[PDB]
């Protein structure tokens with residue numbers, strides 16, 4: 001059985017791994033998930049990667065594939081939501097109000113860097129940059145970023161204590177007890193974090209639509225819900 005090839009935003013690591021297993025349990029169809037920043041995944045797809053399903057951590061990267069004709073609007077829909085959080089290593093005593101002018105930058109200490117997804121392309125980085133900008137904090141940290149290849153890479157920096165703070169998703173924080181949530185960014189500070197899922201237009205996997213459809217089903221949703229994603 002050709003596995004359904006799912007390209008999933010890095011932040012979907014555990015949830016999609018669980019979903020892949022659960023899908024195969026239910027149907028006997030293996031699901032092979034590849035994780036990266038949604039940007040990387042989208043670019044890989046654009047460049048011909050034979051993904052069957054794409055789950056992005058933002059609409060923009062799905063839009064990108066749509067614009068490239070690789071995803072049909074009919075075959076995409078919003079699946080999950082998240083929050084954006086400021087995290088610190090678990091042991092960190094930092095208290096930071098993202099809204100307080102200069103608070104994030106101060107909490108970086110003398111040489112600390114703010115772990116973020118690469119801010120141009122990685123959805124978590126874009127959400128982060130958007131939130132930072134919106135909150136007037138961007139300038140204070142824009143030269144103090146530890147831009148990372150995905151939100152999980154950013155998480156890792158914080159988890160490893162190599163960044164005193166990072167901006168990841170709420171689910172990422174739940175996914176790693178080695179970080180703690182210092183603050184949740186106001187939902188008004190960034191575009192809603194929405195993970196669209198789409199069957200790729202060119203998928204030739206007979207199970208692609210089934211898999212995507214299945215994600216609407218209670219046990220599939222429950223995987224994401226348990227892992228701190230909001231359900232769209």
Ligand code: MOO
Pocket residue numbers: 009010011012036037038039056057058117122123124125149150151152
């Ligand atoms: O595509 Mo991500 O989950 O923002 O690294």
